[PDB]
Design an enzyme around this catalytic site. Sequence first.
Site, PDB file in Angstrom:
ATOM      1  N   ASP A 183      39.480  55.753 -22.983  1.00 19.62           N
ATOM      2  CA  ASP A 183      38.555  55.672 -21.859  1.00 19.62           C
ATOM      3  C   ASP A 183      37.136  55.976 -22.312  1.00 19.62           C
ATOM      4  O   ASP A 183      36.766  57.153 -22.467  1.00 19.62           O
ATOM      5  CB  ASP A 183      38.985  56.664 -20.788  1.00 19.62           C
ATOM      6  CG  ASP A 183      38.091  56.645 -19.561  1.00 19.62           C
ATOM      7  OD1 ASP A 183      37.269  55.718 -19.452  1.00 19.62           O
ATOM      8  OD2 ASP A 183      38.216  57.569 -18.723  1.00 19.62           O
ATOM      9  N   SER A 233      22.117  45.227 -19.018  1.00 17.49           N
ATOM     10  CA  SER A 233      22.322  43.796 -19.136  1.00 17.49           C
ATOM     11  C   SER A 233      21.052  43.065 -18.699  1.00 17.49           C
ATOM     12  O   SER A 233      20.332  43.517 -17.819  1.00 17.49           O
ATOM     13  CB  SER A 233      23.517  43.381 -18.280  1.00 17.49           C
ATOM     14  OG  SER A 233      23.670  41.978 -18.238  1.00 17.49           O
TER      15      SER A 233
END
Length: 330
Positions: free
Chosen positions: A35, A199
Amino acid sequence: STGSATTTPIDSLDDAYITPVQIGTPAQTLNLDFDTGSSDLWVFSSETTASEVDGQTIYTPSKSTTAKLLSGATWSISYGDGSSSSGDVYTDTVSVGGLTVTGQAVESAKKVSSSFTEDSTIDGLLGLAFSTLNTVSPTQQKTFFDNAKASLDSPVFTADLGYHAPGTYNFGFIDTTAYTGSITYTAVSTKQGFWEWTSTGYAVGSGTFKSTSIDGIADTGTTLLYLPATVVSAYWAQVSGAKSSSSVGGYVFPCSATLPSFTFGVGSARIVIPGDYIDFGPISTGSSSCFGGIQSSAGIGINIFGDVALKAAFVVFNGATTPTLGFASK
Ligand code: NA
């Protein structure tokens, strides 16, 4: 040193991926959920409340000749999905794919929430976010990667998750045969303890690319792609009959649909998520309403590039002095 381990989807939807991890001496192999959005290595154990264990493999520190109680240390964690667990702590030898760390903090669960109990396939979590998020008190502990880092050939790990198939976690090296083209690296903020990046935009299907900054985290422990409501609406508007269902808890779409792809930007590069990756199947057995793999992050407080996005790429988690992320197509 290096390590390399295969990671395997837990079910036919890729709801999560499990990776075998050797703990203790002799080794006890547990299948952990790696994770990159958390920083605790915790396991089902011989200490876990009996009624809360249902099919998981447990760690028994008393059977490990290298286990030592980390005296006074406790831990307690709550995840973004509302699940939680807590307990005490041992140090022990932990190996992943041939890479060994001695003195790793292994957080033994005394309690786990129902969602963990109900999932027989996940024996615990192995956190790969920054050690500043580790919950052990009163002495915060280091992640497996942080402990291994100095020994690795290069201070990196890579995630290569498969679509409806196994993939690979590598430690200490880049497998240049595992991706196509070049890897585009992008800046990371560690201020919130995550692999947080920005992004450069998105496209829906064959549509034009929208240049827009989208801050979010690269999180292998989250199944879906969680993005701003504007972006998510733009995607689902291209699927006839798709709608946000308050009762189901997100966007659903007719199972008869053909889903468009979704592209996200990494610098000037582009990662394309095929439409199929966005199908999470019937909301309940036999339903013709299917659950979407792109959902709104509104309410979560952060955007999350979970497995839906990451499995479309070869992803480099570069833990150099100034960390960065890399993405390549594959
Ligand atoms: Na669900």
